[PDB]
Amino acid sequence: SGAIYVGNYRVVNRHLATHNDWANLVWEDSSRDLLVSSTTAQGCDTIARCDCQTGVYYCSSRRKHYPVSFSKPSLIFVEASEYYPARYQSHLMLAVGHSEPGDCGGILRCQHGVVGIVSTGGNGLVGFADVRDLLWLDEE
């Protein structure tokens, strides 16, 4: 579990969005496993606007923050799960690291701010849904 709070927006994994998130929906994309909803309170996170490929992510299954190298956002095939059938997920970045399904929502960050959230994994590879291209998150 986990979310990004920037301005009057909440960014979560689409498969973990609540009824309030869908009722207050701003934007969602199944192929990215992302959903953004509106909030009443101002958020404190800053989205990174960069092409960093090094950062740190939080892994709830280890209660640890791991420094990683990660790939550029790309279209990657993702196996079937209880949430989606087998499909290609876009804007996904992989790193060599530990993750389990419940780790989705854990933030990946670089020196410039929030890069993305854990969304996929397995076989010692963790996958993050990129958010750096969503420039509108920085303005109302």
Is 112 labeled as ligand-binding?
A: yes
Whether 19 is catalytic: no
48 binds, among Zn ion, ligand A1B3Y, none (CB under 5 to 8 A by kind): Zn ion
Is 50 labeled as ligand-binding?
A: yes
List CB contacts of 73: < 8 A, sequence separation 6 or more: 90, 91, 92, 93, 130, 132, 133
Whether 33 is catalytic: yes
Greatest distance between any 2 Cα atoms in the chain: 40
User: Residue 128 phi/psi, 5° resolution?
Assistant: -120, 135
C-alpha–C-alpha distance, residues 14 and 36, integer Å:
8
104 binds, among Zn ion, ligand A1B3Y, none (CB under 5 to 8 A by kind): ligand A1B3Y
Of 28 and 100, which has the nearer Cβ to ligand A1B3Y? 100
Q: What is the DSSP string of 45-83?
A: --B--S---EEEEEETTTTEEEEEEBPPSEEEEE---SS
Is 44 labeled as ligand-binding?
A: no
| Contact set for ligand A1B3Y, span 16-75 (CB under 6 A) | 33
3 binds, among Zn ion, ligand A1B3Y, none (CB under 5 to 8 A by kind): none
Q: How far is CA 102 from CA 6, 28, 74, 106, in A?
A: 23, 20, 23, 9
| Contact set for ligand A1B3Y, span 85-124 (CB under 6 A) | 89, 99-101, 103-104, 118-122
Cβ contact 105:12 at 8 Å: yes
The contact set with ligand A1B3Y (CB under 6 A) reads 15, 33, 78, 81, 83-84, 89, 99-101, 103-104, 118-122
- Which active-site residues does the annotation give? 15, 33, 104
- List binding-site positions for Zn(2+): 50, 52, 110, 112
